[PDB]
From a paper:
The M17 aminopeptidases from Plasmodium falciparum (PfA-M17) and Plasmodium vivax (Pv-M17) function as catalytically active hexamers to generate free amino acids from human hemoglobin and are drug targets for the design of novel antimalarial agents. The M17 family of metalloaminopeptidases, often referred to leucine aminopeptidases (LAPs), selectively cleave N-terminal amino acids from polypeptide substrates. The catalytic C-terminal domains of each monomer are clustered in the center of the hexamer to form a buried catalytic core and are linked to the N-terminal domains by a central helical linker. Each active site has capacity to coordinate at least two metal ions, which are essential for proteolytic activity.
Numbering used by the authors:
A (entry chain C): 74 to 124, 152 to 266, 273 to 375, 382 to 619
B (entry chain D): 74 to 124, 152 to 266, 272 to 375, 383 to 619
C (entry chain E): 74 to 124, 152 to 156, 161 to 169, 172 to 228, 230 to 267, 271 to 375, 382 to 619
D (entry chain A): 74 to 124, 152 to 267, 272 to 375, 382 to 619
């Protein structure tokens, strides 16, 4: 591991990462709701019900089953997110916990409803210490949405304690009709959960823990754990490659720039893919400092969410090991700071493809690092290039906090991203690259400016800028500035890991 | 002729409207580029050419035709928007004006390129006083886009002089293009579509002291008489009987009574559509006054642009008179002012459908008027309800100034709007109604709030609020807040007229 | 049309004005410091000295030759009590004036303030010894400012003749030359005091109706012709710009037009003053930090200065000059009836104006006043008005700016500024900015698209309503109100009077 | 000291400068409009005409001359900036390019109109492949404005491509036809020199701050002094500390580039006035800890905070080339960079100027006047007759005089009127603004002798001039504030404002 520079001896030198979660010690069984009815012998028994629908399945325990047949759920409505739990004596006179969780109207369940049900369920788990949990699915739910339910359940259940100064559930039974049609999703849920969990752990780490050096060290360790080729480019080689845009952003930082390049090569029993993640470990804005009201400087540790989503996907692909596919996981990591050595508003810098860029705003630094990453990616000779980045805060005013935005130059590639959004249940919406705004990026002296003089549609403008660094490879750009961080829950979502993994696997 | 209330005798009482334009005195002829070559007789001959392509057409005048054969256009390269013009003597010793206008690379022309070509060409006309103009189309262009070129040409050519304190225009226009017979059907359509846009732009550009709820409803009456449409203007008392509490609350603070415009077209019996346009003749914001930097209060005469596009569509439909269709043109017209009688932030109002609304912001008044208009429209028993409105300024940060956004509850109707966008060449993009934001509209005391507490995706939120007033009819919503007013040119676009007209005619 | 409309019975119906001041009960005499020496006697004796220069009657003329601690610096002061031939009494004071022969309007304002501070903290007989060389015009200015700082405005206090000086003696070398400036000071002081009283009057007291009634009262006191134009006459005159501004006010517009005609033994002048009794900003409301909405009663300072000069001219009554005192008075408020941002209005000369900002209303009223003044067939048109807050960032709070279309008229304003000692600085009308006032639909916009030089833009707008008459424009937005003292200066009265009397 | 420090190897180490323009390859001739009438034999012919005035000059080609006697102005008004182009066969039946250009009403042309006419014609030169051009002046212009026309023509004709990644066809022959041509022939060489001096200053200003830093800028001055043979003296930090320039040195504390004080000296041949020209030279102004973060602070354009230094160096080129007699000129600039760092000076620091006066730093973004203070002290120690400083000092200028007229302050009426006279003959507009003594107390400090800003007076341009006057004791001194006029916001380029103004001021003394 490369040594992390420190100011005082108390500065941390590694990112604490939990490579083991309570889910690793969890048994998970899918059982037919009728032919393998829940015994209700210990722990928690949760019924997932639709609005104004009564319980229809049975439990093998006579006492509990007789209570259910009374059909008295008090004021439980089945309304989405509502909950009602209580303890009751079994046939062995042990007290088990029964619970109803509402799922909304029947046949209208989407990722939204799934997340609300999983959250309400985890609220009861955090308020208890059961060893066995039984979930009775009295709802119609597709296989991929069933897997997503388990992924989100685990996401809400496992808390992050790495930065606090201060016996979980061991068996999980899932009771649903046609159980055999869902068993193939269980161990996929394990992988997708941890990849998302890994990404969130990197995003939540504060910037004094997660810096360009420690984050690159973590990618080196990751590549060894899931058996990937690993290459970390240092400043000297970056200078040789003429990555002027990427190197200029890091000038003001005490941490040297680190360009992560991991490669997965599957068994030959064809397609080559480049995944690029924005990796700004902390974005102060530069001399265009984030000082305006609402600029959320205290949350800018999450400007490497794109890089985390790529590394989380690297875990998933490195674990699943698909055949006949080659994937490169890339991220130009650095830190955007204020210093005597920082690059200034108005500076003109040269990208690795020779194009000159006038820096109209140093807080638009992400696209500068992506420009050199895109040029690097196209030089690899891949069939598709996909980048994911917390780019434009204007995403909060367009799609908002639930739906990410995808831009691209190839309709076929865009449709693959939308498909993976459906099977991963990470919502994405297609937005246009409007050529009429291109002229607002013109510069009097440089080839381009990195920000627009006239156009307020920042997300569309930023996509136009990035497009200038792809010559003729199918390319797509996913802006997760609005969806990466959950402002209400004050935690990351790990958004993008499952989306990118589905894109690689279906290809 | 309802009397317009005045404060001083100098206050105007009508909207000046030009029912006759120079296009009504212009001859338009489409001629084959080779079999009816341009004679270079008099006036202006403009060659529309692509990048790095030589002139291939011919003129019947031998002096000029010999000049063209030399193939020296100096430094004109064909780049989009560029132009070169000069005067040269023909076979009769008369000085003719020749010109080249660049249309960009070949086979890449869209509504964007066409608008730029038409603008560069009109620059030459406004710098001249020719009686005859000949446009030589050396480009590949589809019929609908060819019609659009003419519509926009006239749009840039005819200037608005109604408010200047201060015959002289072209009389013959010849269009030389290959396979000319396929384009002749478009001319009369261009004449009607142009004036529909021209008419809408005149209502929008009229200042609010001229265009108030009374004078604009008077104009709608006159329009209905000139194109034979059924007309009905609902007054305050009838609106009170219909319990339009939301619409009426917005107008409480104005010296002009509310006026609900209802025009109806019914074609020969040889589908039923409701078109709703937002009609705030001036939006001061109310007690949530538009005082923040960048709120553009001086331009808020444009908050009736939706009403203008509906009336412009009414002219087009009332003139073309299609068969087998019935269209209702609706607009709840009012004015949002500050007064002792104004409704306050925090007031709870009741809509015509019984739902109570807490007014979290008086500057979110358009959706309140549309709410009662949607209830009114659904009572008519129509097959499609489409509204168009300058709703949310957030559109400037999402799609920007070129593309309008469309929301809806019915994918088949949304796709009909998208299809109408392609054949009208008024760009529109489909944006989602994200149900996760609906709870952001909940009110502690009323059924709904009119603005969100948490979500900043203002355009999505507004669409969720409007949806609460559509019970069971296919409905679509077009947000033209970003595209209606051309900020750089300081004039309106008349956006929506041709989009909505194409919608009615196609089915 | 002459009674002030009221919302409640307690709303005031007229402006309280003090037509008599303690200065009218004060006897003033100029004595030669050498010939008729100062007779010490009993009372206050004030010494006006320069820096590092020492003083040069009863007992203390040998007290004439001690003061130490007092250096003579500008504003410094002392005190002492004396023997006398008779004996046992007085006060005697030193007050500095800074280095010798470096006295301008600034130094004398501060000297007069220090002397008034002595009087405010204390007699009936006062003597001021002028051991300084100041010319006759600045000598009158010292007495004008002394009275200005001495008379307090108590019209709006709730608390309730014997409190003031009654005899003032001024000892100065060659005193025969200054004797003529005494009565001119009395006239000039009250003209400035009168203007200040109107400006300080709150907007609920001073409104378009009560201000026009005050003009009616003033004209009666100096026999000036007075004509007040009402809405109906303004409509037939087509003053659409001026009437648009007042649409949202509960007070009807009132156009003041006084006329003075001297005895013929020639020159015709038109003086225009901006008269917005309160400027809320309209729908372009003054809500940003720094907009000073609580002080916008001073947006009729120009009208106040014009009426104050009407008093002086109506009192001095110079020969061979005809003067017209004009002010389109109104109130800029927010209401269902107010004109909106973006409205297009028609001025009385036919030009259409797009209202890019309802807080630029002053120039709309002046536009119709200028057209009105030019139709009177005069030789010079001078307007004074609190137009642009940019003046605070240009010349500041001490110097006013003057623009115009005629160099000779401008230099006459500049020379009047020198003899009136109201500082003014000449600023340019830069024609390159004219294009920024173009409107896509109207002939003109009232504000600029791109140019931030806002005081220059405003003058370009005003110029559009003068066809072919010498015209000058004085922007007093920065100098009218004394922000640290929280009172008006009455700026412009003496400047305009000097311009009229010198002709 | 001369090495440019770099953070990465890709950081530039020199300011690219075009020392050769297409104007250097263009032949220019002035011919009498009557005794040497244009032949209209080849190339492009442009007539400069006033509104509603017919063509009055003739031309040798009888076909073209016949075309001229016939109107052919059916849509040409002569309105300012309008034009009309023709292709016409001459006596030899070859097509000739001929164009009309409107200059507005007669006898009303100022620098404003001439700037628009020059722009209109650059369009025709760009849209024409003719490399021989003849301009016929059918308008009344004095010598100085005629020179200004050529200067601005060149300014708009040449483009700055030093920072484009892409990539010389220009006009080669220019004939100027005007009445009484003999009186205008001397303006040609002057316009050539005045143009490049303006062009050179605009190149230094347009250079981004990572190219133009205190080191590379002083090195450019060294190179300029060699090319034009001037004495060059660059004072480094150690000598600056010896001279006790605490104000100037405090501003650059937070920069990675060391302070560089440029001192160029011209001494004309003896056949004896001494002038000192000081330019503000902040290569980048972030504002310091008083960071430029407020809306409209234009932090992305603050590479132009050395526009004064550029105008002085551009003047040095002109004086070094023209080489007037019996004049000694000093070209000074205290160059530095105002940055945020652990080493920067803080708001509220008290620093000591080289004349002993202590200064409380009420705002670190008012650093320009602090560097000028030590530069003014240095300048008066030279014992000169006039001191003139030029600086992008107060953003308030944009609200007072605006984008077209600069402001001049000073302590000497005679020098101020010389600056105003230079403004008329250089056609760089300037307006005289007052130093109002009543605001002086607003600069007093409870602890220091002075504050660098006022907290009560908002007339910041006047206040700044009052501050600078505290560092001139007994020498005629003028101060030219070009913050509003230096940068053309609509065109997005510098003007090189001040070069010709200062050169005219030196030459006519
Ligand atoms: Zn950023
Ligand atoms: Zn960032
Ligand atoms: Zn609104
Ligand atoms: Zn609205
Ligand atoms: Zn105002
Ligand atoms: Zn005002
Ligand atoms: Zn600064
Ligand atoms: Zn500066």
């Amino acid at each position: 591991a490369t040594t992390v520079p420190q100011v005082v001896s108390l500065d941390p030198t590694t990112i604490p990462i939990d490579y083991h979660t309570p889910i690793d010690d969890l048994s998970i069984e899918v059982k037919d709701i009728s032919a393998e009815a829940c015994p209700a012998d210990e722990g928690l028994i949760v019924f997932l019900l639709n609005s104004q629908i009564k319980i229809n399945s049975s439990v093998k325990d006579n006492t509990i089953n007789e209570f259910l047949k009374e059909g008295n759920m008090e004021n439980f409505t089945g309304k989405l997110g509502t909950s009602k739990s209580f303890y009751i004596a079994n046939d062995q006179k042990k007290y088990v916990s029964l619970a109803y969780v509402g799922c909304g109207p029947a046949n209208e369940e989407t990722e939204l409803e799934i997340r609300k049900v999983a959250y309400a369920l985890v609220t009861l788990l955090h308020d208890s210490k059961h060893k066995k949990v039984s979930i009775i699915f009295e709802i119609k739910i597709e296989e991929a949405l069933f897997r997503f339910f388990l992924e989100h359940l685990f996401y809400e259940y496992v808390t992050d304690e790495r930065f606090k100064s201060a016996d979980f559930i061991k068996n999980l039974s899932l009771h649903i009709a046609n159980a055999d049609a869902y068993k193939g999703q269980i161990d996929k849920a394990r992988v997708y959960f941890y990849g998302t969990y890994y990404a969130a752990q990197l995003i939540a780490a504060p910037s004094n823990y997660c810096n360009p050096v420690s984050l690159s060290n973590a990618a080196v360790e990751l590549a060894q754990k899931v058996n990937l080729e690993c290459k970390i480019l240092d400043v000297k080689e970056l200078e040789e490659l003429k990555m002027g845009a990427y190197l200029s952003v890091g000038k003001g930082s005490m941490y040297p720039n680190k360009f992560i390049h991991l490669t997965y090569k599957g068994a030959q029993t064809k397609k080559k893919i480049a995944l690029i993640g924005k990796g700004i470990t902390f974005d102060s804005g530069g001399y265009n400092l984030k000082a305006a009201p609402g600029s959320m400087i205290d949350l800018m540790k999450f400007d490497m969410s794109g890089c985390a989503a790529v590394l989380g996907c690297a875990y998933c692909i490195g674990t699943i090991k698909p055949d006949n596919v080659e994937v490169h996981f890339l991220s130009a990591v650095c830190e955007n700071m204020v210093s005597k050595n920082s690059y200034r508003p108005g500076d003109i810098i040269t990208a690795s493809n020779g194009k000159t860029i006038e820096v109209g705003n140093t807080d638009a630094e992400g696209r500068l690092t992506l420009a050199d990453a895109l040029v690097y990616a196209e030089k690899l000779g891949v069939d598709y290039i996909v980048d994911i980045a917390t780019l434009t805060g204007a995403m909060l005013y367009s799609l908002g906090t639930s739906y990410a935005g995808v831009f691209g130059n190839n309709d076929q590639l865009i449709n693959k991203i939308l498909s993976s959004s459906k099977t991963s249940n990470e919502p994405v919406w297609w937005l246009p690259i409007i050529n009429e705004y291109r002229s607002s990026l013109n510069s009097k002296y440089a080839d381009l400016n990195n920000i627009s003089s006239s156009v307020k549609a920042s997300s569309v403008v930023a996509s136009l800028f990035l497009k200038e660094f792809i010559e003729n490879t199918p390319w797509a750009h996913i802006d997760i500035a609005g969806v990466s961080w959950n402002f209400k829950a004050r935690k990351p979502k790990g958004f993008g890991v499952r989306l990118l993994t589905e894109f690689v696997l279906n290809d």
